[PDB]
Amino acid sequence: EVDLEVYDAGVSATAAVGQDATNDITLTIEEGGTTLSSPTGQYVVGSEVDINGTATSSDSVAIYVRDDGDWQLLEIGGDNEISVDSDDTFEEEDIALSGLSGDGSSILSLTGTYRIGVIDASDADVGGDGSVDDSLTTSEFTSGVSSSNSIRVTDQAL
């Protein structure tokens, strides 16, 4: 819960901290459940896949890969961020997960079961950086608004 308090007309800004509010109004705030939709379950190594999901209460998001260790970032874009529309939805289609420079791409380039997660770009950085941090640990990824899904990359078929 959070409240807005109006004060008496003519009161100064500095002095208004002392007197009681003439009136106030309260309202509640809730978090946003950002999540991914497209990359989940089965996946084919080297195949280009679409990325989409919801990012309510976020403006930019980042994608990380995990396998018994820290979350590694993928260089999907130049800024490593995906913009969020007015509908709280983000999408970046036709990206090659296994064809990226980041260590997460190399991890996904070998057949097996892994985890892929999405995090807020604002919560992505941990040192005041203007861009997304390269690596985040489990605690940093979990603390911020984030979600994860189980992925399983398999060999190609012809």
Partner: protein
């Protein structure tokens, strides 16, 4: 109390104790098989002033064997083993 083997396909729960502030902190739970492959990841940050936090995990895709559950609060790590079985005795 204690450890109870879980028949695969149903829902399992874990109850633990912590001293951290609920809202500002969180507990990360990782489940791995015998080979150590990550099979389930869960987290929570809601507990009352009793210090008890409960986490629920699905056992549909779990194999049979001594799986490992690891709880991390960001500062310390605790490990435990639970025998996932196809069916229990009752």
């Amino acid at each position: 109390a204690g450890i109870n083997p879980v028949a695969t396909g149903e829902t399992m729960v874990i109850a633990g104790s912590t001293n951290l502030k609920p809202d500002d902190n969180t507990i990360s739970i990782e489940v791995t098989n015998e080979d150590g492959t990550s099979v389930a990841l869960e987290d929570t940050d809601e507990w009352n002033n009793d210090g008890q936090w409960m986490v629920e995990i699905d056992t549909t895709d779990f194999e049979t064997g001594t799986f490992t559950v690891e709880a991390d609060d960001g500062d310390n790590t605790d490990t435990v083993n639970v025998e996932v079985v196809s069916e229990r005795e009752d």
